[PDB]
Amino acid sequence: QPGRFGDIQSRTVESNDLYANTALKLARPSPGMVHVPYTQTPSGFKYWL
Amino acid sequence: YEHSTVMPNVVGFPYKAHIERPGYSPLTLQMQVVETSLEPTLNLEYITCEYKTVVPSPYVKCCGASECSTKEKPDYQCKVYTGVYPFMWGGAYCFCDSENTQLSEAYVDRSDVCRHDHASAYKAHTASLKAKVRVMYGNVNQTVDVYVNGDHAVTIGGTQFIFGPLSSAWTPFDNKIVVYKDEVFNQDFPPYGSGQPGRFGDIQSRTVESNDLYANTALKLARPSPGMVHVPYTQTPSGFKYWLKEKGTALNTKAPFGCQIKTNPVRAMNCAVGNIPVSMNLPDSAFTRIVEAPTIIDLTCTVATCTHSSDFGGVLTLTYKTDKNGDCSVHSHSNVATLQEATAKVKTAGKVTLHFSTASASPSFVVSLCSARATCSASCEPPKDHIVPYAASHSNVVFPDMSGTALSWVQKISGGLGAFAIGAILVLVVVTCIGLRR
Amino acid sequence: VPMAREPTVIHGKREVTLHLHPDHPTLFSYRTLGEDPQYHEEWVTAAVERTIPVPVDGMEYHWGNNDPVRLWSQLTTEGKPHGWPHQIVQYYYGLYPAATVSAVVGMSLLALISIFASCYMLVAARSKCLTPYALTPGAAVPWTLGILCCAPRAHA
Ligand SMILES: *[C@@H]1O[C@H](CO)[C@@H](O[C@@H]2O[C@H](CO)[C@@H](O[C@@H]3O[C@H](CO)[C@@H](O)[C@H](O)[C@@H]3O)[C@H](O)[C@H]2NC(C)=O)[C@H](O)[C@H]1NC(C)=O
Ligand SMILES: *[C@@H]1O[C@H](CO)[C@@H](O[C@@H]2O[C@H](CO)[C@@H](O[C@@H]3O[C@H](CO)[C@@H](O)[C@H](O)[C@@H]3O)[C@H](O)[C@H]2NC(C)=O)[C@H](O)[C@H]1NC(C)=O
């Protein structure tokens, strides 16, 4: 679940697959700018730490 | 054709009114309260802002004595100090060693930007309500702006509507109000002329442009230190700044019934309480002659699925027999179930379906299509979802029908016990009558 | 000014468990939009977790600079309506868990009073109708003996 331990998981260190669920959502850019805004729930590993 | 009704004061509720003229086909109007606004009546009391202490330069009299003079300034203070021997950067003037006198003067004045950052103290009474209602029927849409008191009639497509006074008399604003920028506080401010130092309204101005000022901040002067020229003083800090720091709460985040407070002018919008009576007056052209409308006979109502959820979670089917296809004006004659539509297309096939919303375990209501009638009863299962982001579309009535499962069980049990009691009474009366007949 | 992230809502039974992740001190406040509101406001600083009540009237919460969001609870319960008599009570106990108990108690006491009164009437009638033949050494009239169970089954 986003925001808690294990929001992204991998089978092993060198594994190619990856599961990520962090609630990444894009927003409409402001008029007269080029900046591709977004919002995202912070890292779960850091908050576990 | 005069008609009257009462509609709930809930924003977005799909209220539908059924109008039955015995000589014509029935009509269904859809009225909806898009927006309200509850405006009170205000009387400005005074204006508070931060103060500014004005301290003019001291007057040191070399070799002499000076006399204090009184002035008409807000919170004026003046004193004369004897025996001063001041100093300046290059040398100590007033050659006389000890025959000198210093005069200290200070007074309070309204701040520089008091006309840009100030709080107003009001008195609120006899609020007046306003609305913005959308009315659609037949082929006429359109939203109008009305006063909700039985003294404003607005014409919508040839029909006159008067929205009667609100059922209740509830206003979230208390008697005394303090307004700051975009916030309303239910406060009990001190009357003009009796503020106190260090708290709200230490300085009170009758109007932002008023010349008169009443200031009370315990300004005091103290004797200057030897060998200095500074005019010391002590003063209790501003009351406006401390009111800003510890005003506490608001009315925007505390008002009951879920209604927004706003400012300029003060008003409480979309504030759900009470009922709104309505009076109409329709012309003869709004109705349709009974010859034109289709005839409906043998109306039977069955309920496919029922679920007492906030959305429209019930489905209803009507079977009939008709001579020609056209339109009818459906309606539900009890507020247990609120239908979704006010018109339905009837056809020679003999089947039409309607959607309703209910909040009771077992509803029982009578539904009519054009001129027909039918009684519907159903059994409804609760919803599985815990929370939804939209308000309820039912009238929130929960008492089940007397033919429902629970009340049938109660009836059967009570009937059994009553039969037992009646048998006992009959046996005892028979025994006493046998005793008497002898 | 910046707009803070949307919190994560987890739905419960008339409750919302709400996960808050701020970067700088943001103001969080909510109120229950009924007749008597439940007011609260706070300066959330670190990553916290809040539980807030959502009655059938609904409520709104204001997180940072975002627009207020309103949530309404829905008439959900755990009993089984239209079932056995002990399931309708559960259904109407999940909803309104304070009048169901009172109504059930009242109905039960009424039933007990009625049944005790009826049993008393039968006992008194039997006593009245079996004492007249019980003051003399007379025949119990086997026709009457079978119909009503008196003290002597066969002995006189
Ligand atoms: C120049 O400096 C001298 C001081 O060295 C100043 O003389 C002082 O003048 C004031 C008033 O003009 C005197 O104050 C009062 O004088 C009366 C006189 O009878 C006395 O009764 C009071 O008790 C009080 O002292 C002061 O005594 C006097 N000082 C002296 C004479 O030493 C003079 O005023 C200065 N020049 C100007 C233009 O001010
Ligand atoms: C009576 O008039 C009102 C206002 O003209 C009608 O409501 C309007 O209905 C249209 C059709 O759905 C809405 O247009 C669409 O709205 C959605 C909402 O998200 C939007 O995403 C679409 O891009 C499109 O704009 C319109 O917004 C809506 N207006 C309002 C103020 O709600 C109403 O339907 C009319 N009644 C009848 C019976 O026609």
XYZ file of C-alpha atoms and ligand atoms in Angstrom:
721
model
C 0.000 0.000 0.000
C 1.281 3.520 -0.731
C 3.015 5.399 2.041
C 3.896 2.376 4.197
C 6.474 -0.407 4.159
C 6.854 -2.237 0.885
C 5.042 0.159 -1.423
C 7.500 -1.029 -4.080
C 8.666 -4.633 -4.081
C 11.101 -6.706 -6.113
C 11.608 -10.461 -6.071
C 15.371 -10.032 -5.662
C 18.059 -7.379 -6.041
C 18.867 -8.115 -9.692
C 15.299 -9.060 -10.635
C 13.895 -7.364 -13.724
C 10.275 -7.219 -12.550
C 9.007 -4.542 -10.187
C 5.689 -3.847 -8.483
C 5.087 -0.212 -7.556
C 1.974 1.358 -6.025
C 2.660 4.919 -4.877
C -0.423 6.896 -6.024
C 1.336 8.857 -8.762
C -1.118 11.340 -10.277
C -0.490 13.980 -12.943
C -1.915 17.501 -12.919
C -2.680 20.114 -15.550
C 0.298 22.398 -16.270
C -0.102 26.054 -15.421
C -0.747 28.508 -18.269
C 2.423 29.776 -19.904
C 4.810 27.178 -18.473
C 6.504 23.899 -19.381
C 6.848 21.871 -16.198
C 4.738 18.632 -16.206
C 3.443 18.751 -12.607
C 2.551 15.720 -10.539
C 1.845 14.578 -6.997
C 2.903 11.408 -5.222
C 2.679 9.885 -1.765
C 6.143 9.916 -0.142
C 8.408 6.916 0.118
C 7.315 4.061 2.332
C 10.834 2.850 3.025
C 11.878 6.161 4.587
C 8.793 6.330 6.783
C 9.401 2.736 7.834
C 12.946 3.738 8.753
C -55.355 26.966 -11.403
C -54.091 27.669 -7.891
C -51.887 24.979 -6.363
C -49.719 24.743 -3.274
C -47.005 22.447 -1.964
C -44.099 22.225 0.476
C -40.587 21.330 -0.642
C -37.512 20.534 1.455
C -34.770 23.120 1.861
C -32.010 20.754 0.759
C -29.679 21.784 -2.048
C -29.907 19.440 -5.012
C -32.911 17.436 -3.812
C -35.013 16.424 -6.872
C -38.410 17.638 -5.684
C -41.270 16.819 -8.055
C -44.774 18.246 -7.659
C -47.860 16.485 -9.031
C -50.710 18.728 -10.205
C -54.080 17.083 -10.870
C -56.759 19.052 -12.692
C -59.883 16.848 -12.882
C -60.686 18.031 -16.384
C -57.225 17.493 -17.899
C -54.210 15.205 -17.862
C -51.915 15.251 -14.811
C -48.771 17.374 -14.786
C -45.469 16.933 -12.961
C -43.146 19.859 -12.225
C -39.520 19.481 -11.160
C -38.202 22.114 -8.759
C -34.657 22.124 -7.413
C -32.835 24.493 -5.054
C -29.513 25.193 -6.753
C -28.310 27.723 -4.181
C -29.327 29.714 -1.110
C -27.965 32.715 0.781
C -28.950 33.798 4.297
C -28.115 37.495 4.684
C -28.458 39.124 8.128
C -28.927 42.819 8.854
C -25.940 44.645 10.319
C -25.303 47.854 12.253
C -21.660 48.882 12.531
C -20.563 49.607 16.101
C -16.888 50.584 15.823
C -13.578 49.773 14.138
C -10.483 48.376 15.846
C -6.913 48.394 14.558
C -3.378 48.455 15.875
C -2.302 51.687 17.516
C 0.807 53.811 17.034
C 2.462 55.726 19.866
C 3.639 59.188 18.805
C 6.487 60.540 20.931
C 7.603 64.078 20.006
C 11.116 65.180 20.843
C 11.746 66.326 24.425
C 12.042 69.981 25.374
C 15.009 70.621 27.666
C 14.979 74.106 29.188
C 18.488 75.320 29.981
C 18.492 77.322 33.228
C 14.793 77.533 33.962
C 11.614 75.625 34.693
C 8.829 74.529 32.359
C 5.114 74.025 32.979
C 3.020 71.163 31.619
C -0.082 71.935 29.565
C -3.068 69.670 28.974
C -4.381 68.789 25.517
C -7.380 66.978 24.048
C -5.617 63.984 22.517
C -6.442 60.292 22.999
C -4.587 58.946 26.038
C -2.367 62.003 26.393
C 0.447 61.985 28.961
C 2.763 64.823 29.979
C 5.222 65.344 32.824
C 8.104 67.634 33.773
C 11.313 66.325 35.335
C 13.608 68.530 37.400
C 17.353 68.333 37.840
C 18.324 66.827 34.495
C 21.820 67.376 33.099
C 21.623 66.048 29.536
C 24.525 65.321 27.226
C 25.088 65.453 23.485
C 27.757 64.039 21.210
C 30.256 66.881 21.542
C 29.465 68.241 24.983
C 26.805 68.643 27.630
C 24.665 71.696 27.002
C 22.539 73.534 29.584
C 25.535 75.023 31.402
C 23.547 75.280 34.637
C 24.682 72.327 36.726
C 21.296 71.367 38.188
C 18.724 74.078 37.354
C 17.227 72.370 34.312
C 13.886 70.800 33.478
C 12.804 68.267 30.863
C 9.259 67.936 29.539
C 8.158 64.525 28.240
C 5.130 64.175 25.985
C 3.427 61.197 24.354
C 0.005 60.244 23.016
C -1.688 57.429 21.089
C -2.885 57.616 17.500
C -4.620 55.321 15.035
C -2.176 53.295 12.956
C -0.981 54.085 9.452
C -2.835 51.303 7.624
C -5.921 51.135 9.831
C -8.013 51.569 6.681
C -6.504 48.409 5.136
C -6.281 45.986 8.092
C -9.055 46.504 10.626
C -11.751 44.484 12.363
C -15.399 45.522 12.440
C -17.791 44.947 15.331
C -21.419 44.537 14.260
C -24.860 43.647 15.570
C -26.846 41.112 13.545
C -30.608 40.587 13.640
C -33.619 39.626 11.504
C -31.841 37.732 8.743
C -33.408 37.617 5.276
C -33.171 34.525 3.085
C -32.607 34.306 -0.670
C -32.436 31.461 -3.159
C -31.826 30.414 -6.751
C -34.277 27.759 -7.911
C -34.317 25.743 -11.137
C -37.766 24.837 -12.467
C -38.327 22.503 -15.403
C -41.465 20.904 -16.811
C -43.111 20.159 -20.124
C -40.558 21.598 -22.526
C -39.409 24.567 -20.418
C -36.111 24.601 -18.521
C -34.677 27.753 -16.828
C -33.365 28.928 -13.445
C -34.654 32.010 -11.626
C -33.607 34.097 -8.631
C -36.200 34.568 -5.887
C -36.615 35.946 -2.395
C -37.853 33.293 0.038
C -40.624 35.239 1.733
C -44.205 35.277 0.579
C -43.695 38.640 -1.155
C -41.966 37.987 -4.495
C -43.697 36.252 -7.405
C -41.605 35.276 -10.424
C -43.052 34.135 -13.745
C -41.558 31.072 -15.463
C -43.109 30.275 -18.827
C -46.476 31.814 -17.991
C -46.645 30.357 -14.462
C -46.445 32.453 -11.289
C -44.408 31.039 -8.390
C -44.328 32.389 -4.830
C -41.928 30.788 -2.355
C -43.308 31.112 1.148
C -41.352 31.983 4.270
C -39.020 29.389 5.713
C -40.564 26.988 8.205
C -37.985 27.716 10.921
C -36.301 30.869 12.179
C -32.767 29.598 12.786
C -29.733 31.796 12.080
C -26.121 30.835 12.865
C -25.082 34.417 13.711
C -25.521 35.427 17.340
C -26.514 38.934 18.411
C -22.967 40.332 18.281
C -20.589 39.671 15.391
C -16.955 40.540 14.695
C -15.842 40.403 11.061
C -12.187 40.289 10.002
C -11.338 39.932 6.303
C -13.078 36.668 5.387
C -13.976 35.281 8.812
C -16.919 35.709 11.179
C -16.587 35.286 14.945
C -19.365 34.965 17.517
C -17.866 37.381 20.014
C -19.098 39.567 22.868
C -17.186 42.790 22.329
C -17.142 45.534 24.967
C -19.389 48.534 24.299
C -17.987 51.685 22.771
C -16.236 53.825 25.343
C -15.330 51.005 27.740
C -12.544 48.963 26.207
C -9.710 47.593 28.275
C -5.930 47.697 27.783
C -4.238 44.685 26.264
C -7.339 42.992 24.834
C -9.716 43.394 21.891
C -10.859 46.951 21.339
C -8.310 48.844 23.401
C -8.697 51.639 20.833
C -12.142 52.072 19.301
C -13.036 54.257 16.333
C -16.694 54.775 15.482
C -15.937 54.569 11.756
C -12.859 54.025 9.601
C -13.087 57.682 8.523
C -14.219 59.029 11.903
C -12.020 61.644 13.565
C -12.937 60.754 17.151
C -10.874 58.086 18.880
C -11.066 56.406 22.286
C -7.788 54.850 23.401
C -7.021 53.160 26.717
C -3.656 51.379 26.880
C -2.155 52.487 30.225
C 0.555 54.635 28.673
C 2.997 55.815 31.324
C 6.172 57.897 31.405
C 9.302 57.306 33.461
C 12.108 59.571 34.608
C 15.008 59.742 32.121
C 18.335 58.218 33.040
C 21.177 60.561 34.028
C 23.249 61.830 31.129
C 20.795 60.842 28.398
C 17.991 62.275 26.270
C 15.500 59.552 25.414
C 11.965 60.037 26.864
C 11.378 56.562 28.348
C 7.878 55.142 28.562
C 6.008 51.896 29.167
C 2.841 50.694 27.470
C 0.749 47.532 27.412
C 1.073 45.936 23.955
C -1.545 46.198 21.256
C -4.857 44.469 21.818
C -5.462 43.837 18.127
C -2.289 41.791 17.700
C -3.098 39.613 20.692
C -6.659 39.183 19.462
C -5.191 37.973 16.180
C -2.942 35.530 18.004
C -5.565 34.113 20.390
C -8.953 34.718 18.780
C -9.632 30.997 18.601
C -11.882 29.038 16.239
C -14.140 30.894 13.811
C -17.641 30.501 12.515
C -16.543 29.133 9.135
C -15.260 25.935 10.773
C -17.939 25.692 13.452
C -21.311 26.506 11.882
C -24.062 23.889 12.243
C -26.009 22.259 9.416
C -23.020 22.315 7.091
C -23.289 25.821 5.685
C -20.482 28.042 4.442
C -19.911 31.424 6.035
C -18.695 34.184 3.742
C -17.977 37.894 3.891
C -18.691 41.079 1.932
C -21.600 40.917 2.568
C -21.824 38.452 5.461
C -24.008 35.503 4.502
C -24.365 31.791 5.233
C -24.838 29.824 2.025
C -26.335 26.408 1.232
C -27.508 25.871 4.780
C -29.900 22.939 4.989
C -32.744 23.427 7.473
C -36.511 23.678 7.356
C -39.101 23.575 4.599
C -40.040 26.018 1.845
C -43.773 26.356 1.079
C -44.585 27.129 -2.547
C -47.608 28.697 -4.245
C -48.259 28.456 -7.979
C -50.781 29.738 -10.502
C -50.819 27.959 -13.817
C -52.489 29.050 -17.064
C -54.898 26.898 -19.029
C -52.286 26.289 -21.744
C -49.924 24.301 -19.506
C -52.358 21.393 -19.213
C -53.404 18.995 -21.968
C -57.004 18.088 -22.731
C -57.889 14.550 -21.701
C -58.810 13.740 -25.309
C -55.200 14.173 -26.457
C -53.491 12.095 -23.759
C -53.405 8.287 -24.051
C -55.712 6.115 -21.976
C -54.171 3.653 -19.508
C -56.079 0.688 -18.073
C -55.084 -2.415 -16.104
C -52.030 -0.994 -14.353
C -49.985 -3.577 -12.434
C -46.744 -2.759 -10.624
C -43.971 -5.216 -9.780
C -40.567 -4.560 -8.225
C -37.570 -6.249 -9.823
C -34.807 -5.345 -7.346
C -34.733 -3.124 -4.276
C -31.816 -1.737 -2.263
C -32.132 1.114 0.226
C -29.008 2.962 -0.884
C -28.315 6.659 -1.348
C -28.338 6.417 -5.142
C -31.338 5.251 -7.181
C -31.048 1.589 -6.279
C -34.500 0.244 -7.089
C -36.113 -0.819 -10.348
C -39.853 -0.886 -11.008
C -41.931 -2.248 -13.895
C -45.453 -1.294 -14.971
C -47.779 -3.318 -17.193
C -50.841 -1.785 -18.807
C -52.911 -1.690 -21.988
C -53.053 1.333 -24.274
C -54.770 2.415 -27.484
C -52.037 4.766 -28.746
C -48.502 5.745 -27.804
C -47.555 9.096 -26.289
C -46.349 10.469 -22.943
C -47.486 10.199 -19.330
C -46.642 11.964 -16.086
C -45.435 9.419 -13.532
C -45.402 10.162 -9.811
C -45.023 8.446 -6.440
C -47.685 9.490 -3.960
C -45.689 8.782 -0.795
C -42.311 10.178 0.219
C -41.031 6.698 1.073
C -39.788 6.300 -2.505
C -38.525 9.160 -4.668
C -38.758 8.445 -8.373
C -36.103 9.623 -10.808
C -38.144 10.873 -13.772
C -41.310 12.874 -14.296
C -42.218 11.581 -17.765
C -42.305 8.157 -19.361
C -43.040 6.978 -22.885
C -46.036 4.635 -23.022
C -46.336 2.277 -25.987
C -48.637 -0.460 -27.249
C -46.210 -3.135 -26.017
C -47.460 -2.688 -22.465
C -44.227 -2.477 -20.455
C -42.341 0.469 -18.958
C -39.691 0.588 -16.243
C -38.951 3.249 -13.625
C -36.209 3.789 -11.055
C -36.756 4.873 -7.461
C -34.755 5.526 -4.304
C -35.838 4.434 -0.837
C -34.411 4.160 2.665
C -36.755 1.653 4.341
C -36.530 -2.115 4.602
C -40.020 -2.621 3.131
C -41.613 0.266 1.214
C -45.265 0.623 0.290
C -46.292 3.413 -2.071
C -48.823 4.037 -4.833
C -47.535 5.016 -8.281
C -49.588 6.553 -11.081
C -49.004 6.673 -14.839
C -51.149 9.286 -16.576
C -54.583 8.691 -15.035
C -54.074 5.119 -13.800
C -53.063 3.836 -10.359
C -51.127 0.928 -8.890
C -49.783 -0.138 -5.508
C -46.209 -1.407 -5.186
C -44.629 -3.309 -2.306
C -41.118 -4.704 -2.151
C -38.414 -6.217 0.037
C -35.061 -4.410 0.022
C -31.530 -5.547 0.999
C -28.954 -3.192 2.561
C -25.959 -1.903 0.607
C -22.462 -3.304 1.024
C -20.455 -0.081 0.636
C -19.686 1.908 3.764
C -19.168 5.501 2.561
C -20.098 7.397 -0.608
C -19.216 10.947 -1.775
C -22.768 12.069 -2.692
C -25.714 13.089 -0.541
C -28.821 10.971 -0.097
C -31.605 11.089 -2.678
C -34.327 9.712 -0.386
C -36.440 11.441 2.235
C -35.024 9.242 5.031
C -38.100 7.402 6.313
C -37.372 4.046 7.911
C -40.587 2.699 9.472
C -41.571 -0.420 7.487
C -44.988 -1.180 6.068
C -47.581 -2.925 8.223
C -47.492 -5.860 5.773
C -43.714 -6.247 5.941
C -41.938 -9.251 7.374
C -41.185 -7.785 10.802
C -44.635 -6.316 11.338
C -46.269 -9.497 10.036
C -44.363 -11.441 12.691
C -45.445 -8.956 15.357
C -49.050 -9.171 14.152
C -49.079 -12.972 14.189
C -47.562 -13.217 17.675
C -49.861 -10.559 19.120
C -52.846 -12.260 17.506
C -51.940 -15.585 19.071
C -51.594 -14.033 22.514
C -54.855 -12.132 22.068
C -56.634 -15.342 21.100
C -55.281 -16.986 24.253
C -56.455 -14.087 26.419
C -59.895 -14.040 24.782
C -60.237 -17.775 25.358
C -59.369 -17.319 29.026
C -61.876 -14.481 29.397
C -64.610 -16.501 27.695
C -63.945 -19.495 29.952
C -64.125 -17.378 33.105
C -67.302 -15.621 31.954
C -68.888 -18.986 31.119
C -68.048 -20.259 34.604
C -69.507 -17.201 36.332
C -72.622 -17.285 34.136
C -73.116 -20.966 34.976
C -72.820 -20.006 38.632
C -75.388 -17.247 38.102
C -77.924 -19.197 35.995
C -78.414 -21.492 38.995
C 1.285 29.008 -2.361
C 1.612 25.206 -2.602
C -1.180 22.656 -2.361
C -0.438 19.658 -0.162
C -0.962 16.045 -1.201
C -4.310 14.314 -0.902
C -4.475 11.917 2.076
C -5.247 8.217 1.824
C -8.759 7.354 3.027
C -9.732 3.943 4.374
C -13.450 3.403 4.895
C -14.977 1.940 8.034
C -18.360 1.678 9.758
C -19.237 5.370 10.174
C -15.520 6.175 10.328
C -12.728 7.202 7.970
C -9.134 6.263 8.747
C -7.044 8.942 7.134
C -3.291 8.861 6.453
C -1.589 12.268 6.378
C 1.828 13.026 4.840
C 2.945 16.656 5.201
C 6.226 18.287 4.226
C 5.771 21.470 6.295
C 3.284 22.396 9.012
C -0.153 22.264 7.380
C -3.530 22.909 8.982
C -5.989 20.015 9.135
C -9.554 20.627 10.255
C -12.890 18.865 9.932
C -16.452 19.252 11.140
C -19.529 17.045 11.215
C -22.253 18.810 9.274
C -25.225 17.850 11.409
C -27.394 19.699 13.891
C -24.665 19.607 16.564
C -21.261 19.558 14.853
C -18.079 17.873 16.059
C -15.493 20.620 15.651
C -11.707 20.120 15.546
C -8.618 21.730 14.027
C -4.907 21.075 14.362
C -1.457 21.959 12.996
C -0.190 18.666 11.591
C 3.617 18.647 11.454
C 4.845 15.043 11.098
C 3.436 12.000 9.344
C 0.396 11.027 11.410
C -2.803 8.994 11.146
C -6.298 10.169 12.045
C -9.685 8.546 12.594
C -12.674 10.829 12.075
C -16.388 10.036 12.495
C -18.771 10.209 9.542
C -22.417 9.940 10.636
C -25.368 9.676 8.259
C -25.383 13.478 8.031
C -21.881 13.509 6.538
C -18.794 15.545 7.224
C -16.167 17.694 5.529
C -12.424 17.948 6.086
C -10.028 20.688 5.001
C -6.428 19.597 4.430
C -3.909 22.316 3.694
C -4.747 24.552 0.751
C -6.959 22.007 -1.002
C -10.696 22.526 -1.342
C -12.864 20.935 1.366
C -14.136 17.430 0.646
C -17.441 16.068 1.935
C -18.164 12.430 2.786
C -21.518 10.853 3.668
C -22.056 7.544 5.423
C -24.547 5.053 4.048
C -27.222 2.942 5.741
C -25.214 -0.263 6.060
C -25.454 -2.941 8.741
C -24.652 -6.585 9.473
C -27.955 -8.301 10.261
C -30.173 -10.141 7.803
C -33.574 -8.512 7.192
C -36.581 -10.617 6.198
C -35.143 -13.630 7.982
C -35.831 -15.386 11.251
C -37.016 -13.193 14.146
C -33.515 -13.197 15.650
C -32.042 -11.707 12.455
C -34.423 -8.768 12.037
C -33.394 -7.708 15.535
C -29.742 -7.809 14.469
C -30.535 -5.832 11.321
C -32.372 -3.128 13.258
C -29.657 -3.188 15.932
C -26.859 -2.396 13.511
C -28.922 0.678 12.664
C -30.026 2.749 15.647
C -28.556 0.572 18.421
C -30.494 2.341 21.167
C -34.200 2.099 20.282
C -34.141 -1.527 19.137
C -33.225 -2.733 22.625
C -35.923 -0.599 24.240
C -38.618 -1.740 21.808
C -37.660 -5.407 22.162
C -37.726 -5.142 25.961
C -41.119 -3.443 25.912
C -42.672 -6.037 23.623
C -41.223 -8.902 25.673
C -42.603 -7.501 28.931
C -46.020 -6.992 27.340
C -46.015 -10.603 26.139
C -45.082 -11.887 29.598
C -47.773 -9.798 31.300
C -50.435 -11.007 28.866
C -49.474 -14.674 29.181
C -49.320 -14.522 32.983
C -52.739 -12.858 33.123
C -54.222 -15.543 30.863
C -52.716 -18.369 32.923
C -54.059 -16.707 36.072
C -57.538 -16.540 34.546
C -57.440 -20.257 33.735
C -56.268 -21.134 37.254
C -58.945 -19.005 38.919
C -61.678 -20.404 36.672
C -60.616 -23.963 37.477
C -60.582 -23.195 41.200
C -64.072 -21.696 41.024
C -65.549 -24.514 38.928
C -63.936 -27.405 40.834
C -64.563 -26.297 44.436
C -68.398 -26.708 44.445
C -68.132 -30.465 43.830
C -65.206 -30.619 46.289
C -67.143 -29.844 49.485
C -69.371 -32.953 49.415
C -68.601 -36.661 48.969
C -70.177 -36.670 45.506
C -69.549 -38.115 42.065
C -67.106 -36.246 39.835
C -69.160 -37.105 36.713
C -66.532 -38.982 34.600
C -67.789 -36.977 31.614
C -66.631 -33.857 33.487
C -63.677 -35.729 35.000
C -62.142 -36.357 31.581
C -62.762 -32.844 30.257
C -61.064 -30.978 33.124
C -58.062 -32.453 34.929
C -58.968 -32.185 38.615
C -56.972 -33.406 41.601
C -58.692 -36.855 41.830
C -57.989 -38.666 38.567
C -59.976 -41.769 39.557
C -60.434 -41.681 43.373
C -63.985 -40.294 43.602
C 24.515 82.043 30.754
O 24.828 81.168 31.825
C 24.430 81.672 33.109
C 24.880 80.658 34.133
O 26.282 80.726 34.351
C 22.924 81.921 33.150
O 22.615 82.599 34.363
C 21.497 81.941 34.994
O 20.273 82.597 34.681
C 19.125 81.943 35.241
C 17.915 82.703 34.752
O 18.267 83.625 33.727
C 19.225 81.892 36.767
O 18.154 81.095 37.261
C 17.460 81.750 38.346
O 18.033 83.017 38.660
C 17.343 83.711 39.714
C 17.957 85.086 39.851
O 17.577 85.619 41.114
C 17.460 82.881 41.003
O 16.767 83.534 42.052
C 16.872 81.484 40.781
O 17.026 80.703 41.957
C 17.513 80.803 39.579
O 18.855 80.520 39.948
C 20.550 81.282 37.205
O 20.711 81.415 38.613
C 21.716 81.966 36.501
N 22.972 81.332 36.859
C 24.026 82.007 37.329
C 23.848 83.489 37.472
O 25.077 81.446 37.622
C 22.470 82.774 31.973
O 21.050 82.804 31.923
C 23.009 82.213 30.662
N 22.644 83.071 29.548
C 21.432 83.058 28.987
C 21.225 84.009 27.850
O 20.543 82.313 29.383
C -31.681 22.449 -17.917
O -30.530 23.296 -18.040
C -29.358 22.854 -17.336
C -28.295 23.895 -17.595
O -28.264 24.270 -18.965
C -28.958 21.458 -17.810
O -27.845 20.978 -17.062
C -26.731 20.812 -17.978
O -26.702 19.496 -18.550
C -25.655 19.338 -19.520
C -25.815 17.955 -20.112
O -25.386 16.950 -19.204
C -24.290 19.561 -18.871
O -23.298 19.533 -19.889
C -22.259 18.581 -19.574
O -21.959 18.569 -18.179
C -20.930 17.637 -17.820
C -20.822 17.612 -16.312
O -19.533 17.116 -15.972
C -19.636 18.088 -18.492
O -18.588 17.204 -18.139
C -19.829 18.099 -20.014
O -18.634 18.526 -20.654
C -21.016 18.970 -20.412
O -20.639 20.313 -20.156
C -24.244 20.910 -18.161
O -23.034 21.031 -17.422
C -25.432 21.067 -17.220
N -25.434 22.389 -16.616
C -25.493 22.586 -15.296
C -25.485 24.017 -14.848
O -25.553 21.655 -14.502
C -30.136 20.506 -17.667
O -29.799 19.225 -18.186
C -31.342 21.054 -18.417
N -32.474 20.155 -18.286
C -32.921 19.403 -19.296
C -34.095 18.522 -18.993
O -32.402 19.438 -20.407
